[PDB]
Amino acid sequence: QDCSFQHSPISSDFAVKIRELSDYLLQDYPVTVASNLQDEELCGGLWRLVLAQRWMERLKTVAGSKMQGLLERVNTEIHFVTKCAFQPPPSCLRFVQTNISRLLQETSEQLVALKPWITRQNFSRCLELQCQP
Amino acid sequence: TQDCSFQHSPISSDFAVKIRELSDYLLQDYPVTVASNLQDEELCGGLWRLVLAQRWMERLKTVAGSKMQGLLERVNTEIHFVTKCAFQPPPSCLRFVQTNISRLLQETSEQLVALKPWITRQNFSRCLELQCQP
Amino acid sequence: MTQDCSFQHSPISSDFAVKIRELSDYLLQDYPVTVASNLQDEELCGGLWRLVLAQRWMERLKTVAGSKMQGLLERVNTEIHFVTKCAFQPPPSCLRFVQTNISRLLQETSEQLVALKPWITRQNFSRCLELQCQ
Amino acid sequence: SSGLVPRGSHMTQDCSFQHSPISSDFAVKIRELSDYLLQDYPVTVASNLQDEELCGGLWRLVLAQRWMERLKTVAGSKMQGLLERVNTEIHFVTKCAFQPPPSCLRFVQTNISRLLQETSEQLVALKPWITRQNFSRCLELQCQP
Amino acid sequence: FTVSIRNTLLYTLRRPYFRKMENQDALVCISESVPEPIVEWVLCDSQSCKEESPAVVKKEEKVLHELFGMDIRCCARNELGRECTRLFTIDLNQTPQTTLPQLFLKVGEPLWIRCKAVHVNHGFGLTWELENKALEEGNYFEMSTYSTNRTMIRILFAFVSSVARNDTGYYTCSSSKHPSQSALVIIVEKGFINATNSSEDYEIDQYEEFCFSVRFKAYPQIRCTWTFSRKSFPCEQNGYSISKFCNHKHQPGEYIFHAENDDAQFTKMFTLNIRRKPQVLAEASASQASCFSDGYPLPSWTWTEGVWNRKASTLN
Amino acid sequence: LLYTLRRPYFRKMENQDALVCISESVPEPIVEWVLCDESCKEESPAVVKKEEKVLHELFGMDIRCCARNELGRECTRLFTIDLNQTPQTTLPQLFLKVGEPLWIRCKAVHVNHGFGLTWELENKALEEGNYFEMSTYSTNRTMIRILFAFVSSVARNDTGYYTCSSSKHPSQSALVIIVEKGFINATNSSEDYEIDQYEEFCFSVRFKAYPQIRCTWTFSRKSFPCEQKGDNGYSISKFCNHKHQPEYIFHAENDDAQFTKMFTLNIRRKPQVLAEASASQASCFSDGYPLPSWTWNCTEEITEGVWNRKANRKVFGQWVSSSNMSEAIKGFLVKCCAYNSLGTSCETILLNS
Amino acid sequence: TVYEAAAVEVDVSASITLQVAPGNISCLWVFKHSSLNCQPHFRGVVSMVILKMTETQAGEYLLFIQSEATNYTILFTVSINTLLYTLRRPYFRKMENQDALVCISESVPEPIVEWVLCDSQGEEESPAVVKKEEKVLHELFGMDIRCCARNELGRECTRLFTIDLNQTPQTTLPQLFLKVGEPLWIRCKAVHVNHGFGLTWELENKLEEGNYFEMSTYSTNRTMIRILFAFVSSVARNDTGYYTCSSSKHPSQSALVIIVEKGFINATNSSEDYEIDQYEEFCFSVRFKAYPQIRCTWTFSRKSFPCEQKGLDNGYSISKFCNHKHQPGEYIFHAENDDAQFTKMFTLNIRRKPQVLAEASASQASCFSDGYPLPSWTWKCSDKSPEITEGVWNSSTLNMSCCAYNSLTSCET
Amino acid sequence: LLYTLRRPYFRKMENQDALVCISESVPEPIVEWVLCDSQGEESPAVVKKEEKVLHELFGMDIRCCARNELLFTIDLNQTPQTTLPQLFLKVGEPLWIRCKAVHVNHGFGLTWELENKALEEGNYFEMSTYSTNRTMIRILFAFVSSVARNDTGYYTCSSSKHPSQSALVIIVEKGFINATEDYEIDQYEEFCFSVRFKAYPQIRCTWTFSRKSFPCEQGYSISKFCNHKHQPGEYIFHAENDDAQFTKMFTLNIRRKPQVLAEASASQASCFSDGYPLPSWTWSPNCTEEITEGVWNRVSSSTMSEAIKGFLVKCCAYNSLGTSCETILLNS
Ligand SMILES: *[C@@H]1O[C@H](CO)[C@@H](O[C@@H]2O[C@H](CO)[C@@H](O)[C@H](O)[C@H]2NC(C)=O)[C@H](O)[C@H]1NC(C)=O
Ligand SMILES: *[C@@H]1O[C@H](CO)[C@@H](O)[C@H](O)[C@H]1NC(C)=O
Ligand SMILES: *[C@@H]1O[C@H](CO)[C@@H](O)[C@H](O)[C@H]1NC(C)=O
Ligand SMILES: *[C@@H]1O[C@H](CO)[C@@H](O)[C@H](O)[C@H]1NC(C)=O
Ligand SMILES: *[C@@H]1O[C@H](CO)[C@@H](O)[C@H](O)[C@H]1NC(C)=O
């Protein structure tokens, strides 16, 4: 199932929803980031957003009534990655423990860099996550 | 010689509300610690654990966001009275076990409830030295 | 099937005890880290499971370390980084951790590598991927 | 009294510095120690020190100094040197007979990074006054209530 | 299947009363009325605008848990209108009021006196004294909460299920860190309106600034009306309450003030103001004992040839 | 000093995607951005005010700059086209003087983010430096989108029909009318009115005028201001405090235009015939009514004897007037009647010296 | 306790002096079983001067001090032995306890044993090379590892033979020579990313258990270096052969081991006699393959100058000499090692310019005299006014009882 | 890194307690600060730091160098190098004198003084740092923006735990060279020509002879020249700075050893030629000892008589280093 966005799914006020979630988070809560994702100028940020998105769902299950709303509001900002049939992570994909503050900061950076290209590129080859050989 | 007693009750009536409000913004599986080998004397037990829970509220404030700092401090005020007493530093034999912050908050609430009817009737002078279980 | 773990060539270096003594020279020995309290007695997976956990600690420590301390941690992290070559499953819910000194964690890590050195290339560690509780 | 001055009947409290004990390169020795420290190591700072525009920074430096000694005992061979080098920067506080902390003094757990940062700022603010003020009344640490 | 909103035409709106919920420390507003009313708790600050929400807050719940705060009052609203009962408070922090507050209530009603004191640390107590004598176990309760810095607010409430002559008297609250403030409780057998009425008639000049006044100590809060000729206007209703009326418009006549509560009534008649004026006029030439000169002048002097007819506004 | 209060104008901040309010005045004014939510902003509890230069949260129902200095308060509302909402004035018209900046925000709300927005000047594409689009999320994964269209300084070239269409919404449009100087268009005609005696009557004036006019309802000397309220398109000003008093002139004017409308008023009352009077050898009655018409055994027959009626001897001053000799020949009691639309009334006089 | 030590060697029965915060720092000399008073001078220097080094003088000489310590003791060993001096090159032996090497260099007097590890041409001659005098080396990884012994005779060094599989393929199969009995040491280093790679030695291709061992360590960003070195306790003819190392992620590099029964110098002397060309940019050369690095000397007339005994990229070392200064004669190259000697005679005949007649003699006939390498003269009669005539004789002089013929002269008869 | 174009000057950075090197030159040069661990030297073991702004002003030998191929210290802790050091400068130049003192505890001060008088507020600044155990080093610099005759004088630094050491400042004119000959040696002696001079600024020197000019290894500074090659003649030393010049002529001769091999005699007249700096001449039954009275009177040679009787006669040269002779026949 093809992968492209005719209309931009990235909102203009996404950095606000992340700063608001960060204001109620304990910055040293342990989450993970991929350590060996293949160097790919087109799929790179998209693969990490898919992974960051997978974390927003896991976090909602252990969050309190009000924290669930802040997580869901940030989840909506990057939920578009699920519109695509991204294949399950390969066996070779390794993850490294990081602070939730680092995950949120990187997520913001990935959305900024992806903003000017999200509607101009065909992301069909990104559906298979690749490891660096 | 160092004494520890409360003429007027330091436990507020709405403490369970400030804990439910903090818990609403917390990730329940955040790792904190609880003492694994506290001697558990019928008078000092809850007080020792509140001292330890209090020590955690300070550590948490240092890594909390602007608004989370206020929720922590508001729960810290509910159990801050334990610092009115000269509690000695934990002994070398005290071991700690990792637990969820939800478990720490729940236990703290339980300790305050059970301590509420006795906080002003008992002399806690012997609680200043934290003791290890046999 | 759930098999995928063995080393044809020994990943344990001959100068690993030096990188740990160099880290220890700049660390405050009382700094609180954790060790598993409930790891099943397995004779083959034991040291490997603890090295996986010690490895998990080297990453967490690098995030709160100063410019130069980051290098010492990373240099010890390289000595035990080989555990990540295998798809070790996330820790089970029943795994309990106990607070210990960073000096104890480093000393145990050194001991595990020494005992593991003569067997790392002769054994199949496929069954170690699932950490087990006692 | 362990042998008081035989001239003045109304005590003989003394604590002042004729020559400045604060070095100009103290911020360097603290940044070098901080480079090998785990910033979240737990130390303590006084929570209820009385508001005293003259003794304030001096009391906290005395306390920070007490921490440098405690830390040296649990430090590794090379970390001991970095601690001692920062200890020398604030060791002058021991030239004065500061009385042991009162029973009312409460301490709060803080990061070693916070302790080092405030020690640096206390030395900076104390630098222009260390030789102009009489610190005799600072020998008794005082609490807020 | 049969609960229709088409029934008897009695209808009522009895002011709210208070009752502490079971064991838990929270208050409940019981306001009676034949058409059941909207029960809303309102907590304000240093009050007084009932339609201002940037500091004052309204919470329609019928059960209030956050009893700490400046102006707590319960309000009932149902077809007939809105009757409200304010919770009597004694703030030991608030400056010494040179008035000694008086609390009036009809025998059978529930007495409620909340004592709120704010101290720096928790080290302080609060005590109620029924005229320097012990209070009953089921007549008091203490609540506490933390404020702003490490501040502590303490509440020491005193309550009577159903009052009687026995319960009337001087109540005082003292704190173990604050000055003892007091208030007296006056029990009444049936609503009352006590007003002197010492200004039945008045007199003023053609351009003088004047307002009719009525000072009254009455309970419960009275419904007042200032009527004159036919035109009736409502009113803007120290221990007593003083009602005023200034829109006299220099118009002379009877200005009657009718005020009444649930079990009492009142009516005060205020006669004319009058002013100065010359006003001259000529009457009928065909007349016995003077031709007559009409023209109502002024109350000052009310009206060459002798032997005139009798005058009574017009001189015949 | 030459004190002023020129209405706010808009300029998009060059750095980011946010708008800036440039209101000119002497003395310098209070610049406050007000976001109501509903195209009315009647009260102030639901309404949200944010007095700060440069607005960043441009999403919302009624956005208008507002507030001023010692002179008063001049406001400029941001023209909006909500495709998600019901159609307001069917074909809205936007008027503005040549040189002023045109601003039209197009807002649309859709369930998923899969939808676009486009501006068109009558079936033709828009310039790159004349548009900018923003987007944000709402309620349950909803997406709101705003595609503003802007002109730095308008001219005759820029006048025309603008339309906004969405790739999941119906295309709504609005026409832009550029004006060379201020205007007041109102159906100016000499209007005369006449109320009965107690009926509720209101004077009205419908007008399409730009910029917002300063209006005044003056009569005799007493001048009272107006509720210049604005669904038709034009604004209708009303005046009801007539007090049954019988020329009400409405003078309305803007920066580069003026207007004045004269309204005549009367009170058609039933005739009063109580003014009976008779000199020797001549007798008459005085009738107070807008429509008088006379009539002269006892009081059963009409006498057509002597007359001296009052003709139109009051030009331009026809407001209130009485009306007629009925000369003696034979002496007797005689009745005299006034006639009008609302019936009759009479009085009887004796013919004696 | 604190105690320092130093070695001394007595050179003839001569009178020599021994000297070693300027303040009141107490002194006390402790000679061989006898006490001695002190005289301190100042920074700070104390001395003990002996006149005519007797058999009694030689031995233990201690010097105790006390100022900023309770005891500050020094000790010196004065040796009288006579002429049994030596300087045998360093050898290697792996410390029995762990995986670390030890340098055993034999000599009389005992030498300073210093290990030198420095990067092999990155950018010798110690610009930033690391010298570490320890006699026991543990960090055997990286660079060019060579040990050096230095005694009264001089400095002899033995470099550890390395085979870097990670380094560029050397188009010349290296040869390792060593005398029977000496210890063979061939270290193989291979750098790979991932640590997943093995190393293997083979002499008979197709090695002894106590002749091979491997070490490993990590580099830069998770890189891995592996050392698999082979060692022989005492070599013999049995151990001579082609050794090769192959890696399970690298190309197999090799080197041949040549055992020498005795020390040797093999040099093919070619040309031997030469002639200068006035402007020819020449340098005398000598290519030689010799096991013990030879001590060389270029001597001429009496003036002897040492040589730049550089090594050639073929196996042999080529020594050069260019400071000929166009001076003619015998340039002899004498080179010798521990168990062998060599000498090559290089004749040189430059001149290249005729020198005219000068002597006028009444006795028998006048003389010629010509400074050119092999002139040919003619005797002439057709001088200024006008013939070939005979001239009998006993530079190249000629009695005529004359014009020179060369490739590049004049006279008056 | 030679002192070419305008030599470096110093200026304290207004922002912090650190010094800045301002060296003027056309093309701008490489400005490098060099701090040595000991009194000295240029050997590659000390520390070079090209930064133009130096912050670590504590240390033994601090000096700034301007290159591109176009700090006066008083240590109270240390022993005095010379008896009363002299500092010379041209009017307008900036004076810089750093005083360093090392003490065990921080309880000690440092103070600058002129001839029994205190120093100006904008002419002094002090820094301090810790050493070894818990030692304290202190540097109290004194500085003049632009010197004049007013600023010339004896400056001294005294410490509240150290002995007061001093130095005099001489600041007049714009450049001087103060320096105070014929020589002769035997062909075997090892000799070096010398020149002691106290000069400021650093002089450019040149040792020229015949035409061949060779440069030189330059309280006072002593320049030497030893490549004489036993060649005789005039060796002239020309040294000069920005506002001063100098030239010294050195005559050189060789041993008076006489060579008498140049025998010659015309008929009826005879003489010998003697190659020696100091010749002195001497002219049958006697065994070559009888002196011939003579008729005529007797790098350069010398010459003797007219014939009366014919015979073999010996003639001798005499000098400090003995004699030598040759014999000629009086025939034709
Ligand atoms: C509680 O926090 C505030 C903010 O730091 C401080 O309160 C002020 O303290 C000073 C000194 O006692 C008083 O003069 C002010 O009136 C206080 N203001 C308020 C708003 O409380 C103080 O640091 C803390 N302590 C107290 C007693 O409030
Ligand atoms: C009320 O009055 C009665 C009179 O008999 C008495 O018994 C009772 O104690 C009084 N007090 C209360 C609180 O009821
Ligand atoms: C090893 O060398 C020794 C001595 O040269 C010899 O006796 C032996 O047979 C050799 N063995 C092999 C396997 O080469
Ligand atoms: C050296 O020369 C000798 C003599 O001919 C010969 O026996 C020997 O094999 C040669 N060695 C080498 C390696 O050239
Ligand atoms: C100073 O430090 C050195 C090195 O640690 C030590 O040897 C010396 O004893 C110390 N000085 C004193 C007086 O302790």
Residue with the smallest CA separation from ligand 4 atom 8 is G266
Length of chain C: 134
Contact with chain B for residue D109, Cβ under 8 A: yes
Residue type present at position D82: L
Residue with the smallest CA separation from ligand 3 atom 9 is G238
SS3 for C23? helix
Rounded to a whole number of angstroms, the CA Rg of chain C reads: 15
CB contact at 8 A, E193 and E260: yes
CB contact at 8 A, G197 and G247: yes
What secondary structure letter does DSSP report for B78?
H
CB contact at 8 A, C56 and C89: no
Is residue G43 in contact with ligand 3, taking CB distance under 6 Å? no
Determine if the peptide bond prior to C118 is cis (ω within 30°). Answer: no
Contact with chain F for residue A117, Cβ under 8 A: no
- Give the C-alpha distances (Å, rounded to integers) separating G204 from A85, D62, G208: 59, 74, 11
Residue with the smallest CA separation from ligand 1 atom 19 is E149
Could H130 and D23 be called an inter-chain contact, meaning their C-beta atoms sit closer than 8 Å? Answer: yes
Chains C and G touch (3+ CB pairs under 8 A): yes
CB contact at 8 A, H276 and H319: yes
> Which residues 17-46 of D have a C-beta within 8 angstroms of H?
18-25, 29
Contact with chain D for residue C15, Cβ under 8 A: no
Nearest-by-Cβ selection for B13 from E124, E144, E176: E144
Residue G194 has which token pair?
């991932």
The Cα of C15 is separated from the nearest Cα of chain D by a number of Å equal to: 20
The residues that bridge with G405 in the sheet, in sequence order, are G376
Is residue E48 in contact with ligand 1, taking CB distance under 6 Å? no
Residue with the smallest CA separation from ligand 4 atom 6 is G266
Determine if the peptide bond prior to F27 is cis (ω within 30°). Answer: yes
Dihedral sign computed on CA atoms, order D47, D50, D56, D58: negative
Residue H275: its H or E element: strand H269-275
Query: Where does H124-232 show beta strands of DSSP type E?
Result: 124-131, 135-144, 153-159, 162-170, 176-179, 182-185, 193-200, 204-209, 212-215, 221-225
- Helices D77-89 and D112-126: angle between axes, nearest 10 degrees: 30
Q: What is the CB neighbour count within 10 angstroms for residue G361?
A: 11
Resolution reading in Å: 3.7
Which residue reads 């009496």 in tokens?
G302
CB contact at 8 A, C27 and C132: no
What distance in angstroms lies between residue H131's CA and the mean position of ligand 5's atoms? 12
Conformational region of residue F46, where left means phi above 0, alpha means psi within -120 to 50, and beta covers everything else: alpha
Angle at F68 between CA F62 and CA F73, to 5 degrees: 65
- Give the C-alpha distances (Å, rounded to integers) separating C109 from C56, C80, C83, E59: 12, 9, 13, 61
What secondary structure letter does DSSP report for C118?
T
Pocket of ligand 4 (CB under 6 A): G 264, 266, 289
Nearest CA in chain B to A64: B24
Q: What is the largest CA-CA distance in chain E?
A: 98
Is residue G238 in contact with ligand 3, taking CB distance under 6 Å? yes
Residue G258 Cα: closest atom of ligand 4: 13
Dihedral sign computed on CA atoms, order D106, D108, D112, D116: negative
Burial category of H57 from C-beta neighbours within 10 Å (exposed 0-12, middle 13-18, buried 19 and up): buried
SS3 for E128? strand
- Give the C-alpha distances (Å, rounded to integers) separating H299 from D14, D17, G192, H190, H253: 88, 79, 79, 20, 8
Contacts of B1 (CB under 8 A, 6+ apart): none
Residue E267: its H or E element: strand E264-270
Is residue G261 in contact with ligand 3, taking CB distance under 6 Å? no
Nearest-by-Cβ selection for A7 from F17, F115, F134: F115
SS3 for H24? coil
The residues that bridge with F195 in the sheet, in sequence order, are F267
Chains D and G touch (3+ CB pairs under 8 A): no
CA-CA distance, C58 to C70, in Å (whole number)? 10
> What percent helix, strand, coil does chain G show, rounded to 5?
0, 45, 50
What distance in angstroms lies between residue D55's CA and the mean position of ligand 1's atoms? 20
CB contact at 8 A, E271 and E203: no
Mutate to test the interface with C, among B28, B30, B32, B33 (most CBs of C within 10 A): B33
Which residue reads 């301007």 in tokens?
H66
Domain map (residue ranges) of chain D? 13-145
CA-CA distance, E56 to E246, in Å (whole number)? 31
Dihedral sign computed on CA atoms, order F68, F72, F76, F82: positive
Residue G182 has which token pair?
């000496």
> Which residues 15-74 of F have a C-beta within 8 angstroms of A?
17, 57
Residue with the smallest CA separation from ligand 1 atom 6 is E149
CA-CA distance, C102 to F353, in Å (whole number)? 138
This entry's atomic model was obtained through X-ray
What secondary structure letter does DSSP report for A52?
H
The Cα of D46 is separated from the nearest Cα of chain B by a number of Å equal to: 12
Nearest-by-Cβ selection for F141 from A6, A12, A79: A79
Phi, psi (degrees; rounded to nearest 5) at A111: -70, -40
What residue ranges define each of the domains in chain E, with the CATH number in brackets? 1-85 (2.60.40), 87-189 (2.60.40.10), 192-270 (2.60.40.10)
Residue G106 has which token pair?
């034999």
What secondary structure letter does DSSP report for H286?
S
CA-CA distance, G4 to G234, in Å (whole number)? 36
Residue E124 has which token pair?
């302080």
What distance in angstroms lies between residue E167's CA and the mean position of ligand 2's atoms? 9
Residue G147: its H or E element: strand G144-150
Which residue reads 């909340």 in tokens?
E114
The distance of Cα G116 from the centroid of its chain, to the nearest Å, equals 17
Could A26 and B30 be called an inter-chain contact, meaning their C-beta atoms sit closer than 8 Å? Answer: yes
Strands A95-99 and A30-34: antiparallel
Could G215 and C14 be called an inter-chain contact, meaning their C-beta atoms sit closer than 8 Å? Answer: yes
> What percent helix, strand, coil does chain C show, rounded to 5?
50, 10, 40
Contact with chain B for residue D113, Cβ under 8 A: no
Q: Which of G184, G238, G261 to mutate to test the pocket of ligand 3 (most atoms within 8 A of CB)?
A: G238
Residue type present at position A89: P
Residue type present at position E194: N
Residue G312 has which token pair?
């050639």
Sheet with E82-86, side-by-side order of all strands: E57-59, E38-44, E71-77, E82-86
Q: How many helices (H) and strands (E) does chain B have?
A: 4, 2
